[PDB]
């Protein structure tokens, strides 16, 4: 079934709002890229301050995030994140010009620490043709991660169906979990009916949308319950 993720970007009242939606949350995603000079120590201090799996995500500015870290400092942060026991899922970004081996090295390491890995790719500018979508999913699942995630910006209805078709076909073949997101309200359907098409994770918000098209996890939960 589809798990509902609540995306947060902290730095108490937020704990007030979380426990409020505790029944709508299967996964809490602690975005950390919004802190300057983040350390695993700081992260670990935040987590210990928090029924749902815990996902830790560092989104590079080069992918819609606010994170300003080199490929090396970023990669090492991902690897170090593995030490925190309270972390169940870690998000590592993908991009063709990536140092494959190194990535595969960092991923196997995270899994060695029993962390669920989510290889992700974002494109806030447009939605690649179906074949390219299916392809990007392919490259990302080559590192045999727990989840493959692909968020893309639609410009028309077909961009939405294409994202849906790609994820659907994928969930029908691969032994890997898939996460497809067509951003904006135009793509809201990808978020609410994610389970219908084989999707394993759907992201909502805890107040204000953390990404284009997200709705409150309380509503998102109600929706996922319908389909």
The contact set with a second copy (CB under 8 A) reads 157-158, 160-161, 164-165, 168, 171-172, 185-186, 188-189, 192-193, 196-198, 223, 226-227
Of 84, 75, 80, 8, which is closest to residue 44 (Cα–Cα)? 84
Q: What is the DSSP letter of 174?
A: -
50 is in an annotated binding site: no
> Whose Cβ is closer to a second copy: residue 142's or residue 157's?
157
Tell me, yes or no, if 115 is annotated catalytic. no
Side-chain-facing half-sphere of 54: CA atoms under 13 Å:
19
191 is in an annotated binding site: yes
Tell me, yes or no, if 155 is annotated catalytic. no
As a whole number of angstroms, the distance between CA 112 and CA 69 comes to: 24
105 is in an annotated binding site: no
Instruction: List the catalytic residue out of 122, 155, 157, 177.
Output: 122
As a whole number of angstroms, the distance between CA 87 and CA 54 comes to: 5
- Give 3's strand partners: 201
**Residue 116 CB, nearest distance to a second copy (Å)?**
24
> Whose Cβ is closer to a second copy: residue 93's or residue 159's?
159
Instruction: List the catalytic residue out of 121, 149, 177, 221.
Output: 149
Report yes or no: 78 and 70 within 8 Å, Cβ to Cβ. no
**Residue 33 CB, nearest distance to a second copy (Å)?**
29
59 is in an annotated binding site: yes
**Residue 6 CB, nearest distance to a second copy (Å)?**
19
> Whose Cβ is closer to a second copy: residue 38's or residue 193's?
193
As a whole number of angstroms, the distance between CA 123 and CA 223 comes to: 25
Query: Cβ–Cβ contacts within 10 Å for residue 61, how many?
Result: 11
**Residue 169 CB, nearest distance to a second copy (Å)?**
8
21 is in an annotated binding site: no
- Neighbour-count burial of 140, counting CB atoms closer than 10 A to its CB (0-12 exposed, 13-18 middle, 19+ buried): buried
Tokens of 169: 């076909």
Question: At 169, which helix (H) or strand (E)?
Answer: helix 157-173
Residues that constitute the known binding site? 29-31, 59, 191, 214
Catalytic positions, please? 122, 149
- Residues annotated within the binding site for 3-dehydroquinate are 29-31, 59, 191, 214
């Amino acid at each position: 079934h589809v798990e509902v993720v609540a995306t947060i970007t902290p730095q108490e009242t937020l704990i007030q709002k979380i426990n409020h939606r505790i029944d709508a949350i299967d996964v809490l995603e602690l975005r950390i890229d919004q802190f300057e000079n983040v350390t695993v120590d700081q992260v670990a201090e935040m987590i210990t301050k928090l029924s749902f799996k815990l996902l830790v995500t560092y989104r590079t500015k080069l992918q819609g995030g606010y994170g300003q870290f080199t490929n090396d400092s970023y990669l090492n942060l991902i690897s170090d994140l593995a030490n925190i026991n309270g972390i169940d899922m870690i998000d590592i970004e993908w991009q063709a010009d990536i140092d494959i081996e190194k990535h595969q090295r960092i991923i196997t390491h995270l899994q060695q620490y029993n962390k669920e890995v989510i290889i992700s790719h974002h494109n806030f500018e447009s939605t690649p043709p179906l074949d390219e979508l299916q392809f990007i999913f392919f490259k990302m699942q080559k590192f045999n991660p727990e989840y493959v995630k692909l968020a893309v910006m639609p410009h028309n209805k077909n961009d939405v169906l294409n994202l849906l078709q790609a994820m659907s076909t994928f969930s029908d073949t691969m032994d890997c979990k898939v996460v497809g997101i067509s951003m904006s309200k135009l793509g809201l359907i990808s978020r609410t009916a994610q389970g219908v098409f084989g999707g394993a994770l759907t992201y909502g918000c805890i107040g204000e949308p953390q990404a284009p098209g997200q709705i409150d996890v309380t509503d998102l939960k109600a929706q996922v319950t319908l389909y």
